[PDB]
Symmetry: C3
Subunit: 485 residues, 3 copies
Amino acid sequence: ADTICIGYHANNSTDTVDTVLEKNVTVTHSVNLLEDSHNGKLCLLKGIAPLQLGNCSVAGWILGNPECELLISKESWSYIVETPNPENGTCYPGYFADYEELREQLSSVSSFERFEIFPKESSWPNHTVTGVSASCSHNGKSSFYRNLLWLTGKNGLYPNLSKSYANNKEKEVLVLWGVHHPPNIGDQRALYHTENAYVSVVSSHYSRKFTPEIAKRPKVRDQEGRINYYWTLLEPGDTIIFEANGNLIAPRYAFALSRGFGSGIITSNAPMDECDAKCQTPQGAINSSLPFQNVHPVTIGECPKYVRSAKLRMVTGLRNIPLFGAIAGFIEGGWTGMVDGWYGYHHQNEQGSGYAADQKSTQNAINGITNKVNSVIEKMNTQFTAVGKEFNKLERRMENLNKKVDDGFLDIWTYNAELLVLLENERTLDFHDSNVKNLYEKVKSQLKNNAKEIGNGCFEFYHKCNNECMESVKNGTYDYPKYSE
Amino acid sequence: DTICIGYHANNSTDTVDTVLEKNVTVTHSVNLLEDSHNGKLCLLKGIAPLQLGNCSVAGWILGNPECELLISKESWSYIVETPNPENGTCYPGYFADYEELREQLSSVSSFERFEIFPKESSWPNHTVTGVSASCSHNGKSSFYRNLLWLTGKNGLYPNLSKSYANNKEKEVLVLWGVHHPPNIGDQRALYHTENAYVSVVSSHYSRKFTPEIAKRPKVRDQEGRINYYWTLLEPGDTIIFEANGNLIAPRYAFALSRGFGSGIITSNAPMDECDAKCQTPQGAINSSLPFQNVHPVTIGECPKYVRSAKLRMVTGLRNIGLFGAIAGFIEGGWTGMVDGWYGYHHQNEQGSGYAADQKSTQNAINGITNKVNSVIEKMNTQFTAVGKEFNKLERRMENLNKKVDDGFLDIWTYNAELLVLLENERTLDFHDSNVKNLYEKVKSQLKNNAKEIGNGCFEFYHKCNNECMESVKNGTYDYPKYSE
Amino acid sequence: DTICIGYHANNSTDTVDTVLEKNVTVTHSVNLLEDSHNGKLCLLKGIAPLQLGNCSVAGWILGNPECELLISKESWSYIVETPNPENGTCYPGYFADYEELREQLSSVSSFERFEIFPKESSWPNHTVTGVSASCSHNGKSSFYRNLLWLTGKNGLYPNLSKSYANNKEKEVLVLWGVHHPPNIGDQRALYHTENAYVSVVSSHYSRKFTPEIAKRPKVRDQEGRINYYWTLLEPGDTIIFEANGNLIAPRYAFALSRGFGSGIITSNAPMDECDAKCQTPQGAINSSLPFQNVHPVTIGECPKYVRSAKLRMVTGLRNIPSLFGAIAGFIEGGWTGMVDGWYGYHHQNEQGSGYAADQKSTQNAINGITNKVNSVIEKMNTQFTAVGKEFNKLERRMENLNKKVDDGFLDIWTYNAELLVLLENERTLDFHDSNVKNLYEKVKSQLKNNAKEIGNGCFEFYHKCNNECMESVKNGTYDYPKYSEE
Ligand SMILES: *[C@@H]1O[C@H](CO)[C@@H](O[C@@H]2O[C@H](CO)[C@@H](O[C@@H]3O[C@H](CO)[C@@H](O)[C@H](O)[C@@H]3O)[C@H](O)[C@H]2NC(C)=O)[C@H](O)[C@H]1NC(C)=O
Ligand SMILES: *[C@@H]1O[C@H](CO)[C@@H](O[C@@H]2O[C@H](CO)[C@@H](O[C@@H]3O[C@H](CO)[C@@H](O)[C@H](O)[C@@H]3O)[C@H](O)[C@H]2NC(C)=O)[C@H](O)[C@H]1NC(C)=O
Ligand SMILES: *[C@@H]1O[C@H](CO)[C@@H](O[C@@H]2O[C@H](CO)[C@@H](O[C@@H]3O[C@H](CO)[C@@H](O)[C@H](O)[C@@H]3O)[C@H](O)[C@H]2NC(C)=O)[C@H](O)[C@H]1NC(C)=O
Ligand SMILES: *[C@@H]1O[C@H](CO)[C@@H](O[C@@H]2O[C@H](CO)[C@@H](O)[C@H](O)[C@H]2NC(C)=O)[C@H](O)[C@H]1NC(C)=O
Ligand SMILES: *[C@@H]1O[C@H](CO)[C@@H](O[C@@H]2O[C@H](CO)[C@@H](O)[C@H](O)[C@H]2NC(C)=O)[C@H](O)[C@H]1NC(C)=O
Ligand SMILES: *[C@@H]1O[C@H](CO)[C@@H](O)[C@H](O)[C@H]1NC(C)=O
Ligand SMILES: *[C@@H]1O[C@H](CO)[C@@H](O)[C@H](O)[C@H]1NC(C)=O
Ligand SMILES: *[C@@H]1O[C@H](CO)[C@@H](O)[C@H](O)[C@H]1NC(C)=O
Ligand SMILES: *[C@@H]1O[C@H](CO)[C@@H](O)[C@H](O)[C@H]1NC(C)=O
Ligand SMILES: *[C@@H]1O[C@H](CO)[C@@H](O)[C@H](O)[C@H]1NC(C)=O
Ligand SMILES: *[C@@H]1O[C@H](CO)[C@@H](O)[C@H](O)[C@H]1NC(C)=O
Ligand SMILES: *[C@@H]1O[C@H](CO)[C@@H](O)[C@H](O)[C@H]1NC(C)=O
Ligand SMILES: *[C@@H]1O[C@H](CO)[C@@H](O)[C@H](O)[C@H]1NC(C)=O
Ligand SMILES: *[C@@H]1O[C@H](CO)[C@@H](O)[C@H](O)[C@H]1NC(C)=O
Ligand SMILES: *[C@@H]1O[C@H](CO)[C@@H](O)[C@H](O)[C@H]1NC(C)=O
């Protein structure tokens, strides 16, 4: 009356997965491949602290806005952090030429050095160096940019200035200057004493002649006139020449920059933190190496591909609910006592149900599913892509093209990831069912006609099979001629 | 008394492709590709489109005299134009950021055309009576409706210092022009100042135009030119026009209540009131299916475009390999058994019968329905802004966009076909699984009370009446009852 | 006596990767990744490419004196440029929209260089003898062959009004230059006009250039500049040049007819006369394979570049020398002698040789796997690819966007393909594990209880079965009552 049954394992469950054919399927074990949390703090990126700007923008920090003195000491950074609505920067009204391009240049810079390209006293001995305005007020007092100097006429004369600088820093030198546009002709005749002024910025690769434009303009920050801002990158071994007779905001401090590639500027009000993380988002930082995430499309660093999914769970064990042939077939029950493995046997000579587990098939299935999951996670490589671009009001076609690229990538990744989850969950369930079916077939082949097939995955022995005989059956060392006669 | 296990067959001629086999006839199939369009420029979303007819966008905004039928159009869901519009820019000139302006105007829910500068009061000394034969309407020479040609009066052109403030709480499109004469004689006769200038300045825009006088080839029977410029005055902003000549003044500006993400279609199809969720130059597409092959550029709720001609998914069995069930021991499809997918044949007192086991059939239907519905539903449509326009100097852009779309088209066309093939095979491998298991179940119940014929049929040793057959079908076959 | 079922095995060391297992040795496999280039710049679409040699594109079109070997060109499919553009813009200056001109000159079906304004006849009131050491040739000062330097004559620089009509009925590329002297004295000595202007006007182009005198750093031992501008006169359009000085006039224009959009390849590899459909900077590749890892930048109908180093798909069984419970089940190892097919039987009793090969199952499996591989290869159809893009210093953002377009695509194709070749491989192996197993069952039901099931994939006939009845068994016919008792 001895019986040996073959079955699988079930536990407390409470974890669900989705397959191609069925939804809300409950499984013994599963793995999450979707990151859905962030620390809420702007950690360091690969050991390089971000350049926080606070109440200032990139234009103000580079130009030297008076109210931006809390961040003068900056040497190395990987990305630039901005508040959602910077309040300081371009205190004097004007237009920043190629501003977004300069921001992209400055997002990735090493060994940032601020150096006086033209000394305040030596460079301009014949000009009124001092120049201030109420728009760029500092501590309740009128002031001007720290890195620029408002040259004005001295002794009723503006001598023709011709100042040349050679790049001796063996790097690329960002040089910034400005051109002043008074709102009234008399203001020009007083500041520069020349109605027809000119500005000429010349390099081996740069050449531009700015001509002052005098007209009545709406008041911005209580100033009708406008200072236009321009910038250039002087290459090593190159010389830049400024030649002017008026309306020139002369450079004072230039910046030596090490070449950087591929970083972006994050705009968020979340706090900065001492932590170091390998992937940054505006709202937080993600430490997990899961293939996909559902936090924010704009990511900096080697980040998981963004998806529009809320659940991506992959099956790693048998279905916890008690197709192929074995599970939901001639064996529609789950041995909750199978705490040693996935596939096992049963004893009735002296033991009960759910006592031993066949570690061979269990180990084979474990290795197969582990390789499947590891391949799915690992096949994605590092990106280090600063997804997210900035375009002005005259570049809306650029904005829409970038939006289309990001949206297409998002849609492809979401669709493919969800499909793979469904198909591989179904295939994993089928794989477990095939493994247990093969185990039952092996037991049947070993027993031959010395046992009766009950129908519920059990065999009733035609002889007395003591515990050691059961060990022989499970070990594969069953001796049919021993009990044949 | 014999019980035979079999599957379903019918007269279906539907054909699918699998990974291992091609041109496979199946009992049932589902289409995932939409290839039919109504051929009508139907309504999109909830608003009707705007058709420019013979006119272009430039002629519409600037006020070409032949586009007088387009003045009353206040709101639109999307813009459609004839393939090669002729009206627009009647006076030769250069429209600065014209493609950019088209992109801005496409995503506009509604607009109000208002007289930014009244024709009489704004310019008292300046003569406002200026027309040309290049812009001719009803024989008489004419000029733009929303622009005005300023010329000197009594041999004098006083300096103009006009300004306007945005009180509409919406962005205001302002259009103006700068006239470049062919010869200095026209410059000194129409403006009386040989060296003129124009300055348009706001809180975010500032540009100075100096007239350029040179001999130019005749376009629309005209040597002189008029360069057109535009700006989008933000709410709470003021625009200033200051000039001593060669200024084409704005006469009508447009308060734009802007939308988001709309485009312009170059189509010649007639319009219809379909309220369709999708739109293409040729016609409209049903968004129910996940893939379409009608037109690459699409606007609205349009499915993903693919470069494939057939994407058919199996939702049934093979009409008339793995698990060895279909084309194995069972090699015939039961055309009579139309009740379900799998079943048995009656015998004994029952002369015949083609019963269909509803358990496995309903389970398979649920599974395959979930598969197909997952394939269709997992696809999201969102909104399509496919297509861009680039000028002659943005060729590098035109290729890059061409790289994008084609690239995506190379992915979706490939994967989908794989998805159609890879799953179809499995679908078939699903069906032959179920019946096989079903057979095994019967083979388990009868034990030695029946002999295995070999063709999916069991010959009962004992007499199996209708009640006994129903006992076998339900799985409650009483082995002790019929042991003898 | 006995009949055994088994699968084919050989000594092939070709290994593959599957979802569940890695380093799986298979009897046969197919490579789907191309990693070989001949190192030769084969011509594409049957048209020989244009190799500029040591000349930049600007030097070639402007007519650089050293770039005289590139004058006699008629047609090309793509442009090849050496990594060292030594020759080009010999006189310092700025080339307006140079990247766009390179983009629009990468593919020209018919290229003709015609003297739009003859040197001897167009300018009788001006001196045309303008040369400089910046563009010197054969040891003496020279100038661009396709441009002309106009200066004053008899101490006078009269007004210039020249017009050309597009009678070529093609796209007339016209190049001109504006000279910016370093000193006012040079301007007054060469052009005799301190305030000059150059107006270039057509039906769709109109630009006024004002000379900009300023002290400039010496680049080519020259403190002046010559800014270069160009336009494409449309058919039926007339171009007009009007200038009182500082004009570098056109001498030879080009009647272009643009073709299928292509790019520019930077390569120093030898230009061989092989013919190919795909081109890479390093060489040319297979293109019949759907995937490649030679170079991300490609020209022509090229396979989708992937970041994979091994993309191999199984076409046979697992090579086990001497799921579904087969291959790893009842037959632990496959026969190393059966070479006529993938599945077969073992002769015994009358003929103990053991030769057999079930042709029907083997051929069906071959057809299925061949259809799988052919579908995977063929379903990827790619048209002409021109992924190469060029952007200036002020278009870095654009460049990054292009990179984001490229790398992202590389992230997709790499992830899917490998994953795909991981999945189907396993399936293919499982497919084999189906067939053989089914074959075993087909024998079992055919032999019923006339044979003892040994369990190693064999049936030991209780009766005496000669070669004829064993062949009938392999034919699927076996009279069970005939051999019930023997
Ligand atoms: C740096 O950022 C701060 C914060 O935005 C700036 O303070 C702001 O300064 C403006 C004047 O420049 C203030 O506007 C004032 O509003 C009152 C309202 O009654 C009006 O009467 C005044 O005539 C003036 O328009 C604004 O209120 C003030 N905001 C705050 C929060 O302090 C500061 O000016 C910036 N500094 C630089 C150098 O950019
Ligand atoms: C994938 O599996 C193959 C074998 O199927 C590996 O090839 C074999 O790798 C061994 C590694 O030491 C090489 O050394 C040989 O080892 C054997 C013992 O296995 C030893 O008897 C020999 O004297 C020799 O030292 C061996 O040459 C090589 N080839 C063969 C035909 O055995 C391969 O390394 C595996 N790859 C991975 C990534 O695991
Ligand atoms: C076309 O390209 C050739 C080859 O590059 C140019 O020849 C010039 O060759 C010399 C060596 O013979 C290169 O070295 C330079 O020599 C000068 C003295 O001639 C010396 O002062 C420099 O310091 C340097 O060592 C020289 O770079 C090279 N010139 C250029 C522009 O690359 C030839 O001049 C080129 N012709 C034109 C019209 O661009
Ligand atoms: C506007 O386009 C039309 C053709 O689309 C041009 O042709 C005129 O068409 C109208 C009817 O729409 C006729 O009444 C005129 O006689 C046609 N004139 C010519 C010269 O063909 C028309 O010229 C265009 N008008 C403008 C101002 O561009
Ligand atoms: C080139 O690509 C083909 C794509 O099918 C690879 O396949 C070969 O195709 C040729 C031509 O049909 C056959 O003669 C070979 O027998 C095929 N070989 C295999 C392994 O399929 C081919 O291998 C590729 N060439 C390489 C990688 O050098
Ligand atoms: C499952 O529930 C039982 C309830 O008795 C509890 O003892 C056991 O610890 C639970 N196991 C898990 C893994 O939650
Ligand atoms: C689906 O699964 C979730 C698991 O969180 C469970 O809360 C919910 O009740 C289930 N619903 C159905 C209909 O099975
Ligand atoms: C300074 O520049 C003005 C404007 O071009 C010019 O008139 C004047 O002669 C110049 N003076 C010197 C000393 O260079
Ligand atoms: C399949 O083959 C039959 C037989 O020639 C043919 O009539 C039918 O059109 C084919 N269908 C397809 C889709 O190729
Ligand atoms: C367009 O032009 C054609 C040709 O002159 C004319 O017949 C037709 O009526 C015009 N349609 C509109 C809408 O202007
Ligand atoms: C108009 O502006 C010009 C600018 O050149 C100036 O010369 C002229 O005096 C102005 N008109 C009057 C009436 O002042
Ligand atoms: C002409 O009237 C306009 C309208 O304000 C004004 O700008 C201009 O000064 C007037 N001309 C005069 C007063 O000479
Ligand atoms: C391996 O098999 C191939 C194909 O049959 C054969 O050409 C080769 O000689 C074999 N090598 C060895 C060492 O048996
Ligand atoms: C290009 O210049 C290099 C300089 O070393 C020279 O070796 C090579 O022969 C030159 N090639 C041509 C085609 O002029
Ligand atoms: C040359 O052009 C200038 C500027 O356009 C003009 O002032 C002068 O009269 C012209 N001279 C001749 C001879 O055409």
